[PDB]
Subunit: 39 residues, 2 copies
């Protein structure tokens, strides 16, 4: 429940986070909309 | 051809990577097919 939190690869955490953030945003909208949009 | 390679957030890089990996796998699959499935 309680642990440290030191800096480790900023550029890495930034990029990776952004990517993961999009993945969660896409799936979230997919379910909410419950309907894929065609061309 | 020659670059550094020091440790930086292992548990973080591992988890984040996995997440991003799945995101790319999903987009690649849907795009690869390039065709929506009807009822």
């Amino acid at each position: 429940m309680k642990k440290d939190e030191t800096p480790f690869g900023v550029s890495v955490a930034v990029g990776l986070a952004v990517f993961a953030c999009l993945f969660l945003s896409t799936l979230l909208l997919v379910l909410n909309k419950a309907g894929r949009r065609n061309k």
